[PDB]
Amino acid sequence: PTREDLVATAKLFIAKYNEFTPESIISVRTPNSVSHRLFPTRNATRNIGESMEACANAKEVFKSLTVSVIDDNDTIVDERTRKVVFYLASRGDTIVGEWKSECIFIFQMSEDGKLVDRIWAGFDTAYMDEFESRLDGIT
Amino acid sequence: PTREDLVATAKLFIAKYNEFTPESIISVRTPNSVSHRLFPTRNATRNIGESMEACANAKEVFKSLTVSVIDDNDTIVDERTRKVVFYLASRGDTIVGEWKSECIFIFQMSEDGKLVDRIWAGFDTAYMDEFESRLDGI
Ligand SMILES: [Ca+2]
Ligand SMILES: [Ca+2]
Ligand SMILES: [Ca+2]
Ligand SMILES: [Ca+2]
Numbered sequence A: 001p002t003r004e005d006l007v008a009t010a011k012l013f014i015a016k017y018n019e020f021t022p023e024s025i026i027s028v029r030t031p032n033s034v035s036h037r038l039f040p041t042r043n044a045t046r047n048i049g050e051s052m053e054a055c056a057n058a059k060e061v062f063k064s065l066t067v068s069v070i071d072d073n074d075t076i077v078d079e080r081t082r083k084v085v086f087y088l089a090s091r092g093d094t095i096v097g098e099w100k101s102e103c104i105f106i107f108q109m110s111e112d113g114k115l116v117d118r119i120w121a122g123f124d125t126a127y128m129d130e131f132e133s134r135l136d137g138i139t
Numbered sequence B: 001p002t003r004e005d006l007v008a009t010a011k012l013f014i015a016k017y018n019e020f021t022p023e024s025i026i027s028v029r030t031p032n033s034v035s036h037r038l039f040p041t042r043n044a045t046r047n048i049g050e051s052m053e054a055c056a057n058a059k060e061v062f063k064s065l066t067v068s069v070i071d072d073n074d075t076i077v078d079e080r081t082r083k084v085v086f087y088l089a090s091r092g093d094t095i096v097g098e099w100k101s102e103c104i105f106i107f108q109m110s111e112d113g114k115l116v117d118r119i120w121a122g123f124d125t126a127y128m129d130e131f132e133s134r135l136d137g138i
Helices: A003-019 A048-061 A125-135 B003-017 B048-061 B125-135
Strands: A029-037 A044-046 A062-069 A076-078 A083-094 A097-109 A116-123 B029-037 B062-069 B076-078 B083-094 B097-109 B116-123
Touching: A003 A062, A003 A076, A003 A083, A003 A097, A003 A116, A029 A048, A044 A048, A048 A062, A062 A097, A097 A125, A116 A125, A125 B125, B003 B062, B003 B076, B003 B083, B003 B097, B003 B116, B029 B048, B048 B062, B097 B125, B116 B125
Parallel strands: A029 A116, B029 B116
Antiparallel strands: A029 A044, A062 A083, A076 A083, A076 B076, A083 A097, A097 A116, B062 B083, B076 B083, B083 B097, B097 B116
């Protein structure tokens, strides 16, 4: 698959992910696909079923979510390994208010470049801890 | 520059980084290169002189620092944009105990592929916060 094919599938993943339902967020993944969280403090690996469950729980907190590529010129594409790297802004409306952060997403596409076979997500882990403290303060 | 040329320059950057002196941390960078921190909570930007000053300050805390690419299968190379992505383990001995973390480094090489012209570094920011809080205890 071409560089443009690979970025296209990654942008489709992002679009479905912004719909943020258990079905939409696996919409563009292979059946054996795995989702990794980077960094020791939030280490995690989720197959298709755990990703759906995770999204269902998150929906209790996140009313709507928009992740967007901050600059398409910053996107990294490796045609040999079928990987795309996005640096994304994340904006959310939540039960404790505004969510505003940035994250790095890495996608490895399937052999035909049409599905996402593997994801690595790198979040601002200090911001996540600060958000969890906000959740701990509902009255 | 080939895929292998880009990778070799990033591996050379890491090799010299591990010598951990202001001299070594600039020795594979272009003179006008800038180093970015990813993530809002840690956002910063360092030219060459600022990177030397920060290394000098770090060596007052870090007795040693060692970085390594965990698995070459993880590495991402974009020949068109001349970028290499490494996922790294970092370990160091500190005046407040052990430093142990992981980080993502993105390099963009010069046009001839032989130097690092731009760096983006993504750290575990909660771990970094906690390490700074270990330093606040004196
Ligand atoms: Ca509320
Ligand atoms: Ca909690
Ligand atoms: Ca100092
Ligand atoms: Ca402090």
